[PDB]
Amino acid sequence: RSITLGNSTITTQNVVVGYGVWPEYLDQPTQPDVATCRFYTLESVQWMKNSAGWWWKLPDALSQMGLFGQNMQYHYLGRTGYTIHVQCNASKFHQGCLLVVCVPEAEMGCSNLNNTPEFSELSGGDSARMFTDTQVGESNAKKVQTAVWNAGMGVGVGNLTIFPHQWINLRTNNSATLVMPYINSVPMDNMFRHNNLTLMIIPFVPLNYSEGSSPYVPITVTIAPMCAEYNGL
Amino acid sequence: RSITLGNSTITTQNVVVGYGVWPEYLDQPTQPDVATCRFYTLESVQWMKNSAGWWWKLPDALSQMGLFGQNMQYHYLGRTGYTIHVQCNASKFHQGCLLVVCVPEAEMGCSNLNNTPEFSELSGGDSARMFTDTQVGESNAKKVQTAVWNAGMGVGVGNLTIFPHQWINLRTNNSATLVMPYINSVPMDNMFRHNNLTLMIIPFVPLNYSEGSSPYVPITVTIAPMCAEYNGL
Amino acid sequence: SRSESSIENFLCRSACVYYATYTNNSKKGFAEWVINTRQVAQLRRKLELFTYLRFDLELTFVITSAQQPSTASSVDAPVQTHQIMYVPPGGPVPTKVKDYAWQTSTNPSVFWTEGNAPPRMSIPFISIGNAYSCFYDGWTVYGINTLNNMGTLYMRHVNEAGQGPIKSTVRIYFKPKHVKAWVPRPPRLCQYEKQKNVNFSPIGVTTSRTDII
Amino acid sequence: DIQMTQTKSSLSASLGDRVTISCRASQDISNYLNWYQQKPDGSVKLLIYYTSTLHSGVPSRFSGSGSGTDYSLTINSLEQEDIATYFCQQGNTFPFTFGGGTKLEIRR
Amino acid sequence: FCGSAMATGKFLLAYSPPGAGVPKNRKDAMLGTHVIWDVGLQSSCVLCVPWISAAGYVTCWYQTNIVVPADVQSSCDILCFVSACNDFSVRMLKDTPFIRQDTFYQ
């Protein structure tokens, strides 16, 4: 309870950690830790009744977030781990269920079968891109195919529990916590041309409430980079 | 020889240190040292025949010099020492003499007896203000009185050797080195409303040369902040 | 004979720094002095050989009276009593001879009848900083330094008088005690012009002669 | 320039009364005023070297006041030797500007 | 510095890392990593730097002018050398692009 990091403080009360490993350290690279280790809280998304899902590309959401977004421009390479806190606050009169996965190398598909989706359609800067419950037509040239039952990657959405995940059931649970290590084939990679993580939040059982209750449930995502180091002089 | 500080390197071959003390450390203040400890080299001034002198207000000359000029805006208070390297490069066919003093709290006088000099006339941003060999008239409203024989402070210019100083005689000497501690009445002060040091370079014997030699001698000033700490969270 | 040049034997002397008059029935008559060292030219030159000073303070007042021309009919007055109020830095200030700021509790006053020893009083080192500062290269208006502020003094009669006008003078004597000085400074060459700043007019270096040999 | 205006330029008062000479500037000169006295033989001397501060060697019958733009000079007990011409001179900006004269004489 | 023994000057030797831009001014070249080379003291400056297969810049700037006495020429020259500081790691041999033939030499 009441964990602090740098000059930020959140409050909590189980934790699922990666593939069983903790984020650790490795010309010569430098290690900044007072610069990055703090809780970057993104803005809240509203879970309505006819909602479908959200996704964040992970070293893209913190690309304009203060001093972590400055070291991405100055230094060429870099590796980092993350610690994601997802928590939605609803009463005991609401009902629903969420799945919070964290997909490494989630390559997505376009709506037209011959093209590839453009840069502004994969990730918005610290803003949630959202799934849909219908198809995107082939007349649109460069748009991401956002059928939620295929999860944008052409795979079954029920089989997404093979990744490090956590269920949020509003009857019994309120929060999720994921600790992700650095997963890549090279030890250091460029942070603008590669998004090696993707945080998806998909409602399997939709939100329901009676008349009088609040018609939304806000979801708050909090990301903190752990054990980051960059390559430079 | 070949001393390095951070990511800067100069080359040297005696040193006069302050009032006999070395610059040392002391809510709670933070101490940055990778940010400030590097050699900030100002641009060169040209010592001609009809030259009179130069002066630099010391926590004003580094106010736009990279990362030392950023901590002056972010943090409110701060204390620092300095290490000044002055060196002019002339041949064995030139002749002259310089005095390199470092005056703490060098309050200067206006040309009009009722006013006080304005901010752009005391110190230019990393550019040398220069003395003159004549008087400034009283018709000018807010201008610094720059008669060089009074050193701008109403005092005898021959008596300026009571401060930490060093003579540069082109017959036998080429460089100067001054190490100044923090001299103030309060332990920490604001760095925009107080210039607690002033580096003056005054030619007592003027430059002379024969025809064929170079008609200038450049003077290079190199400042490095030592043992700096700021007050903030 | 090496000890008369110490800092205690050089600066701890007495000096008349102010001289003012005030009468009783003019309803404008009371004195006022803001405590500084920059008024006289011989104490200012001695205290400006150093940059930072730190001293206690000791003041002595010499108060005399004089009978002004009244109308007639046998002026016979009792002894006179004076009030010398000291206002600390950041205190209330009187504007009239009859005011509420004379009767306040945190302004320490002395009361003195004529014909006795003069009323000495002493003031410790009051400052937020660790030393006074004779020179300030910076802004607060250029070179003011609001941190060395010693206060204000006010003087008046406490006797009401109708049969005869009486005016009085006062001479304030200034004496530093337990003096400590840092960072010496060359002695001032040009004449002093203003009180607040270091403005001057340029003068020659020394007196001249007719030949080098 | 700051125009020092003395609008009276002539005063008439008997012996032993209170006289008041006024000098008004153009803008704020901030308590920097001096009062001089020109005897009819031509000798000039300084009386009050501030708004109200007396010069040494001056009798205590003279006094001054004022603030901002308006100022004044007060002689509460007129004597025979006080019959002269009085000027006001500001010392604020460049150049120094003197005021007009003010001649005194007896009433009847 | 292949000049005279009576000439004196100063040079900056700036280095831009891969990703950073080339400095367009003397001042922001000083704000990076640099080595001030004084000619009157030493006549050779060594500058170690990585090189891997934007990739960097080794720009150089006038700090002061060349001060020279009478009857000494002012226009000087500078030579530059290159080597291998540590041991490299070369791999996957191929043929050079600088040599080709159209018919057997005879």
Side-chain angles (χ1 to χ4, degrees), chain C residues 21 45 54 73 88 100 115 118 126 134 163 165 172 184 211:
Chain C
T21 78
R45 199 191 192 263
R54 175 186 176 107
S73 57
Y100 280 105
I126 49 175
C134 309
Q163 296 303 107
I172 310 172
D211 39 27

Side-chain angles (χ1 to χ4, degrees), chain A residues 84-120:
Chain A
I84 309 164
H85 284 111
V86 187
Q87 40 194 354
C88 61
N89 45 3
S91 45
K92 274 151 44 73
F93 285 72
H94 293 89
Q95 49 182 260
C97 187
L98 288 176
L99 168 68
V100 188
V101 295
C102 188
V103 190
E105 314 265 15
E107 205 188 326
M108 290 192 173
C110 190
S111 67
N112 189 23
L113 274 303
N114 284 277
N115 300 337
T116 49
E118 80 174 41
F119 168 68
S120 89

Side-chain angles (χ1 to χ4, degrees), chain B residues 1 7-9 11-13 38 41-44 64-65 87 89 91 93-94 126 212-214 216 218 220, chain E residues 6 8-10 26-27 30-38 41-42 63-71:
Chain B
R1 303 192 43 95
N7 52 285
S8 52
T9 297
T11 41
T12 42
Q13 284 93 303
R38 67 181 302 272
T41 297
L42 317 176
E43 40 175 339
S44 299
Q64 285 148 70
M65 282 288 182
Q87 40 194 354
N89 45 3
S91 45
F93 285 72
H94 293 89
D126 57 46
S213 297
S214 294
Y216 42 81
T220 311
Chain E
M6 302 272 190
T8 306
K10 274 197 215 300
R26 191 214 67 99
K27 179 185 174 183
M30 187 260 304
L31 301 179
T33 173
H34 65 106
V35 166
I36 293 193
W37 178 27
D38 199 348
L41 274 72
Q42 61 197 127
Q63 169 83 28
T64 64
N65 287 17
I66 302 295
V67 176
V68 84
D71 290 283

Side-chain angles (χ1 to χ4, degrees), chain B residues 122-206:
Chain B
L122 271 82
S123 51
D126 57 46
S127 296
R129 285 292 183 274
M130 40 190 60
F131 290 111
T132 52
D133 54 354
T134 58
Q135 287 194 220
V136 193
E138 311 211 3
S139 65
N140 315 120
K142 316 179 73 59
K143 283 220 284 194
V144 189
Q145 182 79 268
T146 50
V148 68
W149 64 92
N150 281 146
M153 324 178 309
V155 79
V157 72
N159 309 329
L160 273 179
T161 71
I162 200 184
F163 295 120
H165 72 299
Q166 183 86 256
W167 289 93
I168 295 178
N169 190 12
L170 285 193
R171 175 192 178 90
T172 185
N173 209 10
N174 198 249
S175 54
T177 301
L178 295 146
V179 179
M180 297 294 304
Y182 184 68
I183 299 163
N184 208 356
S185 60
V186 294
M188 275 189 179
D189 213 331
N190 184 263
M191 318 197 87
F192 285 108
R193 280 187 178 239
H194 196 198
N195 301 317
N196 52 5
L197 271 188
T198 297
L199 173 69
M200 307 183 175
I201 297 179
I202 297 175
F204 269 71
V205 169

Side-chain angles (χ1 to χ4, degrees), chain C residues 13-133:
Chain C
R13 308 268 168 157
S14 295
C16 177
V17 285
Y18 195 54
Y19 157 71
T21 78
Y22 56 95
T23 168
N24 53 5
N25 55 60
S26 177
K27 304 321 295 172
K28 186 62 173 171
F30 69 100
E32 177 194 331
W33 184 54
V34 178
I35 299 180
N36 49 357
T37 63
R38 298 190 165 198
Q39 287 276 4
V40 296
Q42 287 271 7
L43 177 63
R44 191 172 166 177
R45 199 191 192 263
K46 284 168 58 183
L47 292 183
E48 280 187 350
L49 300 181
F50 319 100
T51 310
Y52 307 109
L53 287 152
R54 175 186 176 107
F55 48 87
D56 294 332
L57 201 54
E58 169 164 276
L59 289 86
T60 314
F61 310 94
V62 177
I63 308 175
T64 71
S65 296
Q67 169 201 2
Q68 293 306 106
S70 163
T71 177
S73 57
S74 87
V75 174
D76 186 313
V79 309
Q80 298 290 134
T81 319
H82 305 254
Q83 177 183 7
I84 305 153
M85 195 185 56
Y86 170 64
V87 174
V93 156
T95 73
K96 306 163 299 170
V97 64
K98 294 262 301 193
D99 210 58
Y100 280 105
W102 296 94
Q103 299 296 107
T104 182
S105 176
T106 72
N107 290 177
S109 319
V110 309
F111 291 88
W112 179 78
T113 42
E114 282 186 354
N116 299 266
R120 206 195 298 269
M121 65 190 288
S122 158
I123 297 165
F125 173 70
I126 49 175
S127 181
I128 310 299
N130 291 111
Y132 294 126
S133 181

